[PDB]
Symmetry: C3
Subunit: 242 residues, 3 copies
Amino acid sequence: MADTLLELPDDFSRVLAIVAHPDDIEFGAGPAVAQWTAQGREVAYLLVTRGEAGISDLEPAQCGPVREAEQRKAAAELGVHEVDFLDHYNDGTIEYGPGLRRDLARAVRRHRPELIVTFNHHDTWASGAWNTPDHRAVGLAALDAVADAANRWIFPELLDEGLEPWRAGKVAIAGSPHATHAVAVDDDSRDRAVRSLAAHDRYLGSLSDDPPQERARFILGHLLAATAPRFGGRDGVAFQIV
Amino acid sequence: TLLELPDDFSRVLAIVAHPDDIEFGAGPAVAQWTAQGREVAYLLVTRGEAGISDLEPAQCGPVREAEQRKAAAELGVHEVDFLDHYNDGTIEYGPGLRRDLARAVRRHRPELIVTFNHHDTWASGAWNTPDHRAVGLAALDAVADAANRWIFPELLDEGLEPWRAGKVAIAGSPHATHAVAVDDDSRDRAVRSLAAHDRYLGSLSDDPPQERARFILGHLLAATAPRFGGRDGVAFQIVG
Amino acid sequence: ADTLLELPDDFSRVLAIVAHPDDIEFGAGPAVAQWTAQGREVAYLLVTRGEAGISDLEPAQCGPVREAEQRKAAAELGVHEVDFLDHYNDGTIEYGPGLRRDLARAVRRHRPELIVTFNHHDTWASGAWNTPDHRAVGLAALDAVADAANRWIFPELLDEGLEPWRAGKVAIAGSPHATHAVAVDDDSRDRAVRSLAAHDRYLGSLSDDPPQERARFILGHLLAATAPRFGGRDGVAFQIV
Ligand SMILES: [K+]
Ligand SMILES: [K+]
Ligand SMILES: [K+]
């Protein structure tokens, strides 16, 4: 991790966040998303799964629909209107490969993002705990999909689908232990992100008996505060840029 | 500077790709743990049946299974299980391997999992094998899988309740963080354990296997000493 | 950054294993020209024909063009043996036992003392995100050193008449973590420029500068990146394993 984080250059108006599961975006980047949509930038979400194995007391057939509805409400709190879920992937056993790359390249060509946001694909989390193979798989495939989306002859079936090549400008990896850049966040954007994250009610409920609002405030409080020392005292969300 | 591993575990499961991985990377620690009354079991993905140049794998596998079981017995390890249907040299990382590992984790309920180095390079700097990369990665992944009720739901159908192992210790890691001090009786048991891989070590040189074993482990223990307050020991990278 | 060590002169046979045409020329062309000038035997093995690499040519047109370019480029350097694998697809090369086996088969065929690969790390030397083709091929080539040396991994190779072979060393071109270099003289640089420029349609697709100019700039930049960490000598950097 860099000792001085640079400001993320702000030359983009369309953002596509690609993540494995509901909650990845809120934990990793929600306040930045809030800041971006407050400034009039368009943000869409692509989720590979519904996070249907992520609540110990809800079986997957119950949990998926619940978390989908929670993600859609969280999105609406930030003024994100386009939220799409892939089909046919299973929370916890997402496999990296050409199939996933192609499904993500499809989404990149559909949305024509200037910035793509992913979630930490490294072997370890920001904290140093071991990361999951779902995060590793989706982040890797997303990074790889950038060049795939831009190349006419890779996944030629996409052309038949009516989707012409598109080259995204950069990828920003949220929650990386090798963050290089940061996004400064104001108090209103923070408040909004707290509401967004708090909307994952049953999910947070599975991990704490505290009010959803309170856990969310604490969580995003930590995220932002622990950027400041590397960013000249400013609360912000750190990203690794590629 | 390596920290002494904490002593808050009574059951250990070691998960490795092949026979000899444990005896080369972790044997002296295992000996010390079982001497203290801790229960250790081994799970091996393959029988290392491609690892002896003058025995064909059909003959080799059974020879090395027997060598591994004897090595284990020298350290007081009685539970030794081998998976079926993986091939020495071409183990593939994926959910299938993760599931087999999570099964064993749920069966054994280990508080400590021991793995063998999954990094790109050996402790020495040399290029590591895809078997080791695959099994170590899958075992690290399997901790969360074993703990989650909904991942591999077929495990519940088998009567295997979710279980959360507390820590993973990676042996032979070039990024070690902890170590286990080893007394002389434990060093002796570990030498006998490695030497039980008689045909394996006999294929790599003409020295007697126990002499070779004494050399190899003497080196392993001494390499830890400069970073462990001069105590000889086995180094581990701790995950969790 | 450490000073780069001179690569030891202890080999006569080299096998370069890469994903695509141009990998060799971009990563290591001036070293190859230096080796062939010194009478070393160099062979190339290409997993694909880089048939998705030219944005106005569909793979069925681009495959044959790039193969001819790659043979022309090799000839500029006095590389005769250029092998292509079949049934991999440019852009979606999959890492695994099957690729390893194909590579081990080449290693046993050629008996190289030094294997040259292209950067398999997640990032290019520049920090830009590497491709899964490069990650896959480099990784499988590094793994194939042991596979080629082991009688029982891929037992079918024995039946094909390929006895085990242990290569000495792998040198990775274009690595962000280089350790050694090969000094390159003016003659070799000039030959490498001609070799890279032979990728005429490919380079013509990437920028609209004359390919000859473009080749000179790219390879000048390669040689100059190494010089300050190599006693001021122009060279090609490698990570040795
Ligand atoms: K997640
Ligand atoms: K092994
Ligand atoms: K390439």
